[PDB]
Design a protein around this ligand. Structure first.
Ligand SMILES: NC(=[NH2+])c1ccc(N)cc1
Ligand SMILES: NC(=[NH2+])c1ccc(N)cc1
Ligand SMILES: NC(=[NH2+])c1ccc(N)cc1
Ligand SMILES: NC(=[NH2+])c1ccc(N)cc1
Ligand SMILES: [Ca+2]
Ligand SMILES: [Ca+2]
Ligand SMILES: [Ca+2]
Ligand SMILES: [Ca+2]
Ligand SMILES: [Cl-]
Ligand SMILES: [Cl-]
Ligand SMILES: [Cl-]
Ligand SMILES: [Cl-]
Ligand SMILES: [Cl-]
Ligand SMILES: [Cl-]
Ligand SMILES: [Cl-]
Ligand SMILES: [Cl-]
Ligand SMILES: [Cl-]
Ligand SMILES: [Cl-]
Ligand SMILES: [Cl-]
Ligand SMILES: [Cl-]
Ligand code: NA
Ligand code: NA
Ligand code: NA
Ligand code: NA
Lengths: 235, 54, 235, 54, 54, 235, 235, 54
């Protein structure tokens, strides 16, 4: 996250970090004790992925952390990296052992399609992650967050030569300086409804981070909430 | 009065009933409060809630 | 303006104040030396209106001010207070004598319909005025300004039982505390394009100012830019 | 290249020409700068400009 | 089942009720038939009806 | 009507003819015993208007006819001939004496806005009238009718340099030869729902009748059904 | 085709029949000498497919016919029978040997996305095939054709409980009796532009053929024209 | 005059040029006729054409 602020411990208790060949290569959100939702492009790899919940400083111990192995990855069935790296950018990770729910390890709420879209259209979401604090920069140690406004779809399409699909939305600032960035992908874009946060997007991609005239591109979760609930069901 | 206006005053979800009535509901881990509009935790760690002192 | 900030002198050199039976009952914007654009509901009166340009503190003298009389009022032809007080809320005031253009008395730019809408859809506009600083409060002495985000149309329609017409748009914040207010109506909603401000709205109405879950309602100027240019033409 | 992408790099207005070319233009009181993309004042008090020191 | 699909099988108007139920209704001069879906004349010359032999 | 067919007696028992300085200058539809709905441009005149219901051959007697005088005309409040001859092209005529309802004098049904639009979107309507049977031609003696398909809005806008407002819709055929025409204006565009006809449009205007690449333009009644019910209420 | 008419020889010289384990199980259209465009669900089989161009009566010889083997099938990359049998219902068949172009074996024109959609929105297309002449009926011997009107999207969605995707459009009649049917799938939906036919759809699916209140569902070719041109390129 | 109105009078395809001008074009196997609006066959069996007597 470029131009955000340090989260306070447990401020985003649904946030998880994904660790592999490299630490904090992507984020994710807790759906329930056994499942994480992330971006499919994060998990288009043969390397083993570790999930860390209750995380605050990826280089310190707060005594609130929980590490798990990923035993199965379900990319959305429409995702196809050969055709497009970011269209239908959503996947689910099954954990080996359940997370233990507490003040620091709490699921994100997920409404149905209609309400996820109503929540998105309120127009102001929070993105969080341990991604780069500047374009081409170092990762954050302390989890970062940033409030981002929703961007009009035609305005977003005019901002780039790259195709913005209807499975994506844009959010962020024109002026540059504030945006999600490499390492944040997979993490949450949430909307707070009377103190209860709901998942409204997945941090997906962009061109250069926090560049003037450019926006953050996010997976439009409303189109996938049914699939999330159907694939992550426990009982 | 109607889900089409101010979410029928439901904190989370609203469904229209017959004759300009509405039924409010909440996401998993929450229950409809006394007022039949608000949502309150029904579990120890309800989703999307910050419980650590800020 | 509730929850805004004091403008610096000449920061909004297109802003004018309208004075009548009561001072600063509405604002307006300079189209050219002889014409002001304002809200039609401001000028649905038989009382004489005075326009003041180069104004900063409505109770002090900066030596940059210019007072004019209104000799003719052109409400938009669709405006009809009997049917609806705020639909097609736009009018033009012809001044008796031309304003003298300077660093403190400068017109607002007005693009065509397509570009006014593109500018509006950038999603962040500035509103300014001497209206109330709190709902039911006192007027501002120093011109106030506030940056307001554009609001999704369906979200705005869901926020109120009152009809939001396609000649209007909504802007502002859900959380309450920041909004235009009585006395600001008629003034500008502008969008800055590479340092050049363009008129994107007219401050029109709302329910209680800066109330949580409520937005500012603005005349969608894009639908009227041709009429503005056609009626205010000098040569 | 096209008005459909980044306003054809025009600061203000863009019009598509034949064979993926564009013509940039500016509002009243402004002229197309040397670069044929930017807008510069062509009058003493161009619209929408803040000229008082901030 | 739902007004969103085949007008909830109502001949004229449909309104959604709670728990996937619907209420059918008819325009002025018509009444809801026995089947609670169809509309039948309730007046001598109901609107929009051709009664002269064709 | 160009290229239609003769109606059978009582096939369109809601149809009325308007007679003035010239016979059958427009049509109309029976709302109830005292009110006709027609096009506002038909009744932008100082000449007295006569309404004839139960009409089949405007030059013969079927013994099913009823003549009335118009005592008041209510053009829609948005109609403004000075700005545009056909935008908001709808008016109501109050009759001096009530029509006597029978198999030949029957009102047209009028649904609410939502259902009038659903009915229009079924895409096939009937237009009827005593208008010209060819462009610049003679009027019809026997009432004519024609089934017309709804036309996509962008396709209609591309067909003409004239503005097609959102208060209008287009219907008819590309190939030329079938269309409403002068003298039909004011009459009904109806949609049959399980044998019950509902008013979905008002015959309004077009360029040359039944010309290739041109369509009939109709008032979109859905936007006015509430006003019709509110102004024509008897008890 | 239910309720259509017999084509005249060479009236649809782009039409081909697909033969397999069963004759005339689907249709197709000639893109060029080596490629046919059809529906992906037609060619979700391991059985060998034969293509016949210049065909009129599938049980007679006109001396205008050309039989080819299919050497490769390219279903669109988004088609996924496991998720949905008809979404992205389009495929290409490469022929073993080129067809010889003549008055009876002629390609269908294919415009770009913008113009294919403009052509579709003209609202009247021709469908042709050797499919069933009644729901559950026998195949046609002589190629059948039927003009079908485009159906409003919301009207189509209201007609069925099955999802109508944005990759599909609906066309046909409410009243029942006229529609495409089993065996026509894969064949063309074309729009004539000044005597030149363009491909606007692929016959895809429906519930019971020609049922009242139901429509034919077609692949919206505009979304795939670029892919057709890119995959069928010869030089 | 404009592609936005009557396809700029082009039989098939239209592209807007600078200063309210348009360029008409045709699909593969066709060429722009003398009038610079109409499309005529440029090959023996142009696509989408019925050449057998009807
Ligand atoms: N928002 C961005 N610019 C961005 C986000 C994620 C990412 N992987 C790259 C760029
Ligand atoms: N934005 C507002 N709440 C508002 C604006 C102007 C006004 N006259 C009243 C209320
Ligand atoms: N549909 C038409 N071309 C038409 C309809 C009415 C009319 N007054 C003139 C032309
Ligand atoms: N249009 C139809 N009802 C239809 C079309 C093709 C098909 N395979 C089945 C049904
Ligand atoms: Ca740590
Ligand atoms: Ca002062
Ligand atoms: Ca007569
Ligand atoms: Ca044969
Ligand atoms: Cl690093
Ligand atoms: Cl900001
Ligand atoms: Cl909210
Ligand atoms: Cl006061
Ligand atoms: Cl804010
Ligand atoms: Cl901008
Ligand atoms: Cl005559
Ligand atoms: Cl026809
Ligand atoms: Cl119907
Ligand atoms: Cl059979
Ligand atoms: Cl028909
Ligand atoms: Cl056409
Ligand atoms: Na930026
Ligand atoms: Na507020
Ligand atoms: Na025509
Ligand atoms: Na049917």
């Amino acid at each position: 996250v470029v131009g955000g602020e340090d989260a306070k411990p447990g401020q985003f208790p649904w946030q998880v970090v994904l660790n592999g060949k490299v630490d904090a290569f992507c984020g994710g959100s807790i759906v329930n004790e056994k499942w994480i939702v992330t971006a499919a492009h994060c998990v288009e790899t043969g390397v083993k992925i570790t999930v860390v919940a209750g995380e605050h400083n990826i280089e310190e111990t707060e005594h609130t952390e929980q590490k798990r192995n990923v035993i199965r990855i379900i990319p959305h069935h429409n995702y196809n990296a050969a055709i497009n790296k970011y269209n239908h950018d959503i996947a689910l990770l099954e954990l080996d052992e359940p997370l233990v729910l507490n003040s620091y390890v709490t699921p994100i709420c997920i409404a149905d399609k209609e309400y996820t879209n109503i929540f998105l259209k309120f127009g102001s979401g929070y993105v969080s992650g341990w991604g780069r604090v500047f374009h081409k920069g170092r990762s954050a140690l302390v989890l970062q967050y940033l409030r981002v406004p929703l961007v009009d779809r035609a305005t977003c399409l005019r901002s780039t030569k790259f195709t913005i699909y209807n499975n994506m939305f844009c959010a962020g600032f024109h002026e540059g300086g504030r945006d999600s960035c490499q390492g944040d992908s997979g993490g949450p874009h949430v909307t707070e409804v009377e103190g209860t946060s709901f998942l409204t997007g997945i941090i997906s991609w962009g061109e250069e981070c926090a560049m003037k005239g450019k926006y953050g591109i996010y997976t439009k979760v409303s189109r996938y909430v049914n699939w999330i609930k159907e694939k992550t069901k426990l009982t | 009065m109607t889900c089409n206006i101010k979410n029928g005053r439901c904190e989370q979800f609203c469904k229209n009933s017959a004759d300009n009535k509405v039924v409010c509901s909440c996401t998993e881990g929450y229950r409809l409060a006394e007022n039949q509009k608000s949502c309150e935790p029904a579990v120890p760690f309800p989703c999307g809630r910050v419980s650590v002192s800020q």
